[PDB]
Structure formats: C-alpha cells, structure tokens
Design an enzyme around this catalytic site. Structure first.
Site, PDB file in Angstrom:
ATOM      1  CB  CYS A 163      -0.927   0.040   1.244  1.00 35.78           C
ATOM      2  SG  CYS A 163      -1.501  -1.620   1.798  1.00 35.78           S
ATOM      3  CG  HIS A 298      -3.060   3.399   5.225  1.00 40.29           C
ATOM      4  ND1 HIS A 298      -2.645   2.967   3.986  1.00 40.29           N
ATOM      5  CD2 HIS A 298      -3.439   2.285   5.902  1.00 40.29           C
ATOM      6  CE1 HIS A 298      -2.758   1.650   3.914  1.00 40.29           C
ATOM      7  NE2 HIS A 298      -3.229   1.213   5.067  1.00 40.29           N
ATOM      8  CE  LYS A 328      -6.003   3.343   0.648  1.00 38.32           C
ATOM      9  NZ  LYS A 328      -5.210   4.490   1.141  1.00 38.32           N
ATOM     10  CG  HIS A 333      -6.245  -0.182  -0.497  1.00 36.25           C
ATOM     11  ND1 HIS A 333      -5.182   0.422  -1.147  1.00 36.25           N
ATOM     12  CD2 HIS A 333      -5.703  -0.879   0.538  1.00 36.25           C
ATOM     13  CE1 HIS A 333      -4.058   0.144  -0.501  1.00 36.25           C
ATOM     14  NE2 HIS A 333      -4.343  -0.638   0.527  1.00 36.25           N
ATOM     15  CG  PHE A 390       0.629   3.703   7.612  1.00 36.61           C
ATOM     16  CD1 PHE A 390       1.826   4.406   7.415  1.00 36.61           C
ATOM     17  CD2 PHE A 390      -0.383   4.306   8.353  1.00 36.61           C
ATOM     18  CE1 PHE A 390       1.998   5.693   7.942  1.00 36.61           C
ATOM     19  CE2 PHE A 390      -0.218   5.592   8.886  1.00 36.61           C
ATOM     20  CZ  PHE A 390       0.968   6.288   8.702  1.00 36.61           C
ATOM     21  CG  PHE A 392      -0.883  -5.730   3.495  1.00 37.14           C
ATOM     22  CD1 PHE A 392      -1.705  -6.259   4.494  1.00 37.14           C
ATOM     23  CD2 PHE A 392      -1.485  -5.121   2.387  1.00 37.14           C
ATOM     24  CE1 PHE A 392      -3.107  -6.161   4.395  1.00 37.14           C
ATOM     25  CE2 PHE A 392      -2.903  -5.013   2.277  1.00 37.14           C
ATOM     26  CZ  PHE A 392      -3.711  -5.532   3.278  1.00 37.14           C
TER      27      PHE A 392
END
Ligand code: CL
Ligand code: CL
Lengths: 404, 404
Positions: A163, A298, A328, A333, A390, A392
C-alpha cells in the site's frame, strides 16, 4: 540540499479519468465503487470494486501497449497527462540523463502470470504463452513499459511496498533531486484490478463482504460497521522536479515536498504496530516549521487499521491535530497506485482550497473521538498537507507537501 | 557525502549455499547448472537450470516461513549469513530506526500467484487459497518477509528492475547512507526457481535449449555457440554500512562502494541499447581515481545481449580493458538475485585476491577482440572491482567497489 517540487500530475482513478473529473468527484463526495460481476463469478465473497471507467482501447501505440499489463496502461496514461500538465516538451525531457522514472505496482500482473501458466498447461504450450508475458508479468513492468516509449535516460526502476508503493516512489524521486542526480523524476504507479489478485486479499479476510447489495456504501473508513477494504485499480504520476530547474522554465508548481518519512514496524506482517507510523509521521515532519492543515489518511476501512493510525495521529500531534479525511471511502484501495493517487488528491485540495469528505460514516468509531474527521466538503485555504501510506509487511511512508 | 562500506555478506546460490562453497566454486570454475525434470515436464524447450541445492526444511521458524515464497526463504537465509558475517548482535541491529532493509525480486512469486488462482478455481475456493498468499505473491514479498522477523525499524521496501534488481537495491542502500538517513541497510534480493516463470522466458526464446544433454556447457557467455541464458534461483544479502559507524564497532570491511551508476536505455524495448550501458559504467566510474582492475560482466549468454555489453565495455575502456569474466557461465541467471550475488562474487575476488574464470568459451565472440576476457582462475592483487547489471526493460546498474 536541493529542493523538490511537484510541477505536473496525471491520474486514472475509480473517481475520474483525469484531474478535472477527479476534482469534481472529490468535491461531490462521489463514490467510484461499483458491483463487479467478475468478482462475484470468481467465487469471491467481496463483489465490489473501484474500477477504472475509462475505455483504454486505442489510447496507446500498438508496439508500446503489446508489452503492457493494465498497471502499465494506467501508469502510462497518467504519465502522458502529467507531462502535458507540466508543460514539458520532448526536447526537454527525452534522451536526457537528468530525467528519470520511478514507478511501481504492488502486485505486478497476477492476471498475466496466471494467463502464462494456464496457456503453458494446455496442448500448445509455449506457442500459447506467446513472447510478451515477461514484461506484463514482471514486478518492474510499470517502469520498464514507460521508460522506453518516453525515452527516459536517467533512473528507471520500480519500488514496491504494498500500500506504500507509489509513496516510496515519490520519496525516492525526491531523494534523487536532493542528491543532485536528477532534475526531473516522474514518480507514481499503477495497479490492475482482477479476481486473480483480489481473491488473495479476500482469502485473508481483508475485503469488505457485507455490503455487496449497496456498493457505494461498502468502503466506510472510521464507520463503526466497516468490514474491510474495497479493492481498486488505476494509476497516477507526478513530475518531481528540482526547484531551480522548475523556476528557470516558468513551471507551474503545485507544492514543495518538504517531508518524506519511511519506516518499518519490525513487528507484525498483516496489522500495523502504530509505533512504525508514529515514527514515520515525525520523520516527515522534521524541520517542517508549519502545522499540518489537512491529513489524507491511509484509512482503508479495516477494523484494526483505521484506529491504529488515528492513535498514531494523536501521539504525533497531541493537542494540535489536523483536519482528516479518508478518500478511500470514495475511491477504494488501489494498492500500488494508492500513494500517488492520494498525493494527487491532496495536491488538488491544496491547489483548489478545499477538504474532500470522509464519506459513509453513519456512526463514527469511538477511537476517532476528538479528531476533526471532515465529513462534508469544506472550502478552506490550505498551506501544508500530509498523506500517509502504511503497507502490508509493516512498511510506512508519509509525504508532506507545502505551498511554495 | 557520507561513505558506504560492505561489512557482511550472505548467499544462497546455484554454486554454493554459503560463501565458502561459493569461494571454492569460483576458484574451481565449477558449474551450478543441472538438468531439470520439472522444466522438461512443464513442456519447455529449456531443461536446464541453476538450482539451489539445499534442503531448507525446518531452517526457518514455522510462524515466519508460513508467509514466504522461495525468494524470501533464500533472501532470509542469506540475510542470516550476512548478519553472522558482520558480527551483528540482535541488540546491534534490531528495533533501531537507523537500520533498514532494501531487498527485492524480479518476479515476486509467479508460483504463488498461480497457486492462488488455481486454488480459487477448485473446490475449496478461498479456503484453498489460504491467508498467506499476499505476502508470498506481492512484489514487496522479500522485504516484507524479512523486515518483520529481523525487527527492522528503518527503511523497508523492495526495488524491482529485472536483472538489475538487487544491484539497484544496493545502490539505494548507499544513497540512504549518503543522505545520513541510515547507519546500516541490509540490501539484496531473492528469486524462486519455477516453470511458472521460466516458461515465459522460454516462450520469448531467451533461454538456452541446445545443451540439455550437457547441462554444464549450456551457459557460455561470450562463446560463439551460445544460445540463451540459463535461468537460476537463489538469494543474496550485503550489509551496507556508514564508514565511521563500521569503524567504531570494529567491523570487518570488505570494500567501500565508490561508484553507483543507474541509467535507462529509453530505446528499443526488446534489445539492450549499448549506449545505456556505456552511460551507466561511466556514471559508476565518475570520480574514481584508480583503474578498474576486474569487471564482473552482466553477460547472460544471449547472442545479442553479450555483444552489446562487449561493445559497451570497449567504448568505455578503449584499449585498457580490465580483467573481465562472466560468472553467469558458472551460475546461470538468478534474475532478481543476480545483482547482489555478483556483487558478492566480486567482493570475494577482491577479498581473496583472484579472478574467477569465464568458463565454457570454446570460440570467443569476435566482438570481444581487444578485451581481457579471463578464462582461467588467476591469482592477482585486486584493488578496485566493477559489477554490471543490464536489466531487461532497459534499466541499468553498475557498482564499483574498492579496498579502503
Ligand atoms: Cl477551482
Ligand atoms: Cl584464502
């Protein structure tokens, strides 16, 4: 030493096919989320997505597009828009060792990787695969497929960080300017939208599944009944340029990149530590002597993630927290494309003087209390904006952009 | 304006599961190439590969390995080795904001992208797919899968750029040190070995197919009868460290990274340009006051690619060629892992004072006339070494390493 400014942008998003359409959607609080027959057909539980609603047929030269997966198509079209917006002529940016490209995807092309393997397993084997799958399927496809046709001679590579992908691309582009190595770096990313990849996220319980009958309501960052993110695809590109070079050519400058944070959690694979994020925002804020007027979070619409970030936002800002919205909730996303797209939404807010709404909040999460989650489009002169990404794997990026 | 050195290394390769096996294979001219029944069974024309000959069962903690594709496993083991090699205590590198990780792969995990879609299409759907496919399949898998368990707090992302991937990873690590952002950055990469990816290369005609009966003769960089590269898998990692920090802890310093070129061809998508490679090597040599003693070439054993590199080396060095060898004739092409594995072969030569041989040259290509291609192991006191990585998609990296 050197200062880096953004002098052009381009975007292909679930909420618009260029900056004019995106600006309108942001002002309207318009959802880009639709029901997906493809996702439903694949056997997934999440049947909603942030699709690009541009017909891309015919928009790219035959000998160029034959190498490309959708991530590269979206990134290429975004780059064409950015070059036009920046007012750059090929004389200036092509065959120029001081001009680079750093652009990535989170996933590459699972569609083309799976196509390769399916074709190879049929009776025709290699002949069914054809000679074009590598550029489509490789993780560096978005940089490779753009650097050739745009005749880039400087840096050319893809950063990936889930991301955070295209935020780290923008920050590394800023580092090339600061190191004195490049005058311009095109930075951004793209991401295809496909059941092949989407099903991986559904399998980890990451995607919204309870709202398929009302697609526009599924993505709902900060809402008490959020149930996971809505996957999206698209692209974006920004022109990162050394300040003196920009002024010397009469560039239109959106903002200076005054901060770039990049950290690691070194804790959990699939959930944020908050600790990594606090450090990342502080790093991005270091030496920034003006307050953050607007923070594009985020905020993916996940139960744990949404509030970990807000906790981090509290710890960083104390009793002086910024206006916040999660775009978002409108856009979904877009993974590798999220960083650059959200930098672009933030730059449009800065340029046009408004804050886009955090939509679909029917009941605000209790851990959002005391923070200005902006839920209606609000005209406001902004000076300094921040955007968090932020990813994965515990990888963090924050960008801070300020009027010159 | 800070200086960067290599203080540790680690490697899992077709020619050694560690640096001792690697050093020995380098001195011996030993081929890592074997026949592959998997490749043959897949329907490919190329039945040879540079396999990692290591049973990894039980080598990584069950709750760490469950997130990993082979690229990550190979990079993880290499990183374990590199940490041991650098004399780094958990207390030295873990939970430290000034300590980072930049490591990538060329392809991510084609095998797990394909596994995901295959599992989705079968009777267990999402339950077959499982919750670990994103971290295996995503482009940033290698950096994500290592940053967590090694408790990294600084920079964390992946670069991808095909054959140049882990060379740009190393260069970016150097940049982090130069900018004063990091004290240590672990830099490297990994690549799985699998028909799922290999067949895409074979389908474009890139792989060797005429030497299946004699696997060790297949990879034959600069030989008149070369017929494509031999795909390989593996991993590598180096510890990139700020000079003073390394000295202050009494680290063993292999070399200073005194040059780093990164350029783009911007030309013909298919062929390497020649010019991009010239510009890359010249960029890496800028300001370096000592001759290049030895050059580890990119040379993959392809008809066009090998001649383009030869021609570029002759343009750069004129009549003053360094000693040159193509270690890929021994090792095959490990794609994302190549840059760091070849930086390591190069450092082992600089460390142990020898030039590894360029093997399998029966008739030297005529484009190699006037150069010093070394085809027998030669003891020599080296001081400055160069390693080229000229990546598919026109993306170039070169590293120059020198004794302190
Ligand atoms: Cl306006
Ligand atoms: Cl020795």
């Amino acid at each position: 030493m050197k200062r880096a400014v953004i002098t052009g942008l381009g975007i292909v998003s679930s909420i618009g096919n260029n900056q004019q359409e995106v600006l309108a959607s942001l002002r309207e609080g318009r959802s880009g989320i639709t029901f997906s027959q493809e996702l439903k057909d694949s056997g997934m539980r999440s049947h909603v997505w942030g699709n690009v609603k541009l017909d891309t047929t015919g928009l790219i030269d035959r000998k160029v597009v034959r190498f490309m997966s959708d991530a590269s198509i979206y990134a290429f079209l975004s780059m064409e828009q950015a070059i036009a917006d920046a007012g750059l002529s090929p004389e200036a940016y092509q065959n120029n060792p001081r001009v680079g490209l750093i652009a990535g995807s989170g996933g590459g092309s699972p569609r083309f990787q799976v196509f390769g393997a399916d074709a190879m397993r049929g009776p025709r084997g290699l002949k069914a695969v054809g000679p074009y799958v590598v550029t489509k399927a490789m993780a560096s496809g978005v940089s490779a497929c753009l650097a050739t046709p745009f005749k880039i001679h400087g840096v050319n590579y893809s950063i990936s960080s889930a991301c955070a992908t295209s935020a780290h691309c923008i920050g590394n582009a800023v580092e090339q300017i600061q190191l004195g190595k490049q005058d311009i770096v095109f930075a951004g990313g793209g991401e295809e939208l496909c059941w092949e990849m989407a099903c991986e996220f559904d399998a980890m319980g990451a995607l919204s599944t309870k709202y398929n009958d009302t697609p526009e309501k599924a993505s709902r960052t900060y809402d008490a009944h959020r149930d996971g993110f809505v996957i999206a695809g698209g692209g974006g590109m920004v022109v990162v340029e050394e300040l003196e070079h920009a002024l010397a050519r009469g560039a239109h400058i959106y903002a200076e990149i005054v901060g770039y944070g990049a950290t690691s959690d070194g804790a959990d694979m699939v959930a944020p530590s908050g600790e990594g994020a606090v450090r990342c925002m502080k790093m991005a804020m270091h030496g920034v002597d003006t307050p953050i007027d607007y923070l594009n979070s985020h905020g993916t619409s996940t139960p744990v993630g949404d509030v970990k970030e807000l906790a981090a936002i509290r710890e960083v800002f104390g009793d002086k927290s910024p206006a916040i919205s999660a775009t978002k909730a409108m856009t979904g996303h877009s993974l590798g494309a999220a960083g650059v797209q959200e930098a672009i939404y933030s730059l449009l807010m800065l340029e046009h003087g408004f804050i886009a709404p955090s939509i679909n909040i029917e009941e605000l999460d209790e851990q959002a209390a005391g923070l200005n989650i902006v839920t209606e489009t609000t005209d406001r002169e902004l000076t300094t904006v921040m955007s968090n990404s932020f990813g994965f794997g515990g990888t963090n990026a924050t960008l801070v952009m300020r009027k010159l």
